[PDB]
């Protein structure tokens, strides 16, 4: 589907910046 964005959005699904996690890309 979405290269890197997939891992990104994987991070977005965790809450994005709200997760506290640092975005994959």
PDB file of N, CA and C in Angstrom:
ATOM      1  N   UNK A   1       0.839  -1.219   0.000  1.00  0.00           N
ATOM      2  CA  UNK A   1       0.000   0.000   0.000  1.00  0.00           C
ATOM      3  C   UNK A   1       0.863   1.254   0.000  1.00  0.00           C
ATOM      4  N   UNK A   2       1.409   1.579   1.161  1.00  0.00           N
ATOM      5  CA  UNK A   2       2.112   2.834   1.356  1.00  0.00           C
ATOM      6  C   UNK A   2       3.504   2.588   1.928  1.00  0.00           C
ATOM      7  N   UNK A   3       4.530   2.725   1.100  1.00  0.00           N
ATOM      8  CA  UNK A   3       5.896   2.454   1.538  1.00  0.00           C
ATOM      9  C   UNK A   3       6.353   3.456   2.592  1.00  0.00           C
ATOM     10  N   UNK A   4       6.857   2.919   3.706  1.00  0.00           N
ATOM     11  CA  UNK A   4       7.315   3.698   4.865  1.00  0.00           C
ATOM     12  C   UNK A   4       6.132   4.326   5.603  1.00  0.00           C
ATOM     13  N   UNK A   5       5.201   4.884   4.842  1.00  0.00           N
ATOM     14  CA  UNK A   5       3.971   5.442   5.365  1.00  0.00           C
ATOM     15  C   UNK A   5       3.180   4.406   6.123  1.00  0.00           C
ATOM     16  N   UNK A   6       3.225   3.186   5.660  1.00  0.00           N
ATOM     17  CA  UNK A   6       2.630   2.094   6.349  1.00  0.00           C
ATOM     18  C   UNK A   6       3.168   1.980   7.780  1.00  0.00           C
ATOM     19  N   UNK A   7       4.492   1.962   7.915  1.00  0.00           N
ATOM     20  CA  UNK A   7       5.147   1.949   9.214  1.00  0.00           C
ATOM     21  C   UNK A   7       4.841   3.239   9.950  1.00  0.00           C
ATOM     22  N   UNK A   8       4.786   4.316   9.185  1.00  0.00           N
ATOM     23  CA  UNK A   8       4.416   5.619   9.694  1.00  0.00           C
ATOM     24  C   UNK A   8       3.071   5.545  10.340  1.00  0.00           C
ATOM     25  N   UNK A   9       2.083   5.292   9.537  1.00  0.00           N
ATOM     26  CA  UNK A   9       0.721   5.214   9.931  1.00  0.00           C
ATOM     27  C   UNK A   9       0.457   4.157  10.974  1.00  0.00           C
ATOM     28  N   UNK A  10       1.286   3.164  10.963  1.00  0.00           N
ATOM     29  CA  UNK A  10       1.377   2.228  12.066  1.00  0.00           C
ATOM     30  C   UNK A  10       1.627   2.979  13.385  1.00  0.00           C
ATOM     31  N   UNK A  11       2.449   4.000  13.276  1.00  0.00           N
ATOM     32  CA  UNK A  11       2.753   4.940  14.369  1.00  0.00           C
ATOM     33  C   UNK A  11       1.564   5.895  14.588  1.00  0.00           C
ATOM     34  N   UNK A  12       0.887   6.277  13.494  1.00  0.00           N
ATOM     35  CA  UNK A  12      -0.261   7.170  13.537  1.00  0.00           C
ATOM     36  C   UNK A  12      -1.410   6.469  14.225  1.00  0.00           C
ATOM     37  N   UNK A  13      -1.493   5.165  14.005  1.00  0.00           N
ATOM     38  CA  UNK A  13      -2.544   4.365  14.584  1.00  0.00           C
ATOM     39  C   UNK A  13      -2.339   4.191  16.079  1.00  0.00           C
ATOM     40  N   UNK A  14      -1.093   4.313  16.521  1.00  0.00           N
ATOM     41  CA  UNK A  14      -0.784   4.235  17.943  1.00  0.00           C
ATOM     42  C   UNK A  14      -1.185   5.539  18.619  1.00  0.00           C
ATOM     43  N   UNK A  15      -1.446   6.547  17.797  1.00  0.00           N
ATOM     44  CA  UNK A  15      -1.805   7.850  18.303  1.00  0.00           C
ATOM     45  C   UNK A  15      -0.949   8.934  17.697  1.00  0.00           C
ATOM     46  N   UNK A  16       0.002   8.523  16.867  1.00  0.00           N
ATOM     47  CA  UNK A  16       0.918   9.465  16.262  1.00  0.00           C
ATOM     48  C   UNK A  16       1.758  10.155  17.319  1.00  0.00           C
ATOM     49  N   UNK A  17       1.882  11.489  17.263  1.00  0.00           N
ATOM     50  CA  UNK A  17       2.615  12.265  18.268  1.00  0.00           C
ATOM     51  C   UNK A  17       2.060  12.061  19.674  1.00  0.00           C
ATOM     52  N   UNK A  18       0.788  11.677  19.750  1.00  0.00           N
ATOM     53  CA  UNK A  18       0.125  11.453  21.026  1.00  0.00           C
ATOM     54  C   UNK A  18       0.633  10.168  21.681  1.00  0.00           C
ATOM     55  N   UNK A  19       1.231   9.288  20.883  1.00  0.00           N
ATOM     56  CA  UNK A  19       1.758   8.032  21.400  1.00  0.00           C
ATOM     57  C   UNK A  19       3.041   8.279  22.188  1.00  0.00           C
ATOM     58  N   UNK A  20       3.771   9.317  21.806  1.00  0.00           N
ATOM     59  CA  UNK A  20       5.057   9.582  22.420  1.00  0.00           C
ATOM     60  C   UNK A  20       6.173   8.909  21.655  1.00  0.00           C
ATOM     61  N   UNK A  21       5.798   7.907  20.876  1.00  0.00           N
ATOM     62  CA  UNK A  21       6.723   7.207  20.008  1.00  0.00           C
ATOM     63  C   UNK A  21       7.252   8.152  18.942  1.00  0.00           C
ATOM     64  N   UNK A  22       8.501   7.968  18.515  1.00  0.00           N
ATOM     65  CA  UNK A  22       9.060   8.724  17.416  1.00  0.00           C
ATOM     66  C   UNK A  22       8.803   8.070  16.061  1.00  0.00           C
ATOM     67  N   UNK A  23       8.147   8.831  15.180  1.00  0.00           N
ATOM     68  CA  UNK A  23       7.735   8.391  13.851  1.00  0.00           C
ATOM     69  C   UNK A  23       8.843   7.676  13.090  1.00  0.00           C
ATOM     70  N   UNK A  24       8.465   6.594  12.397  1.00  0.00           N
ATOM     71  CA  UNK A  24       9.396   5.745  11.638  1.00  0.00           C
ATOM     72  C   UNK A  24      10.074   6.509  10.503  1.00  0.00           C
ATOM     73  N   UNK A  25       9.318   7.396   9.870  1.00  0.00           N
ATOM     74  CA  UNK A  25       9.852   8.287   8.853  1.00  0.00           C
ATOM     75  C   UNK A  25       8.936   9.496   8.691  1.00  0.00           C
TER      76      UNK A  25
END
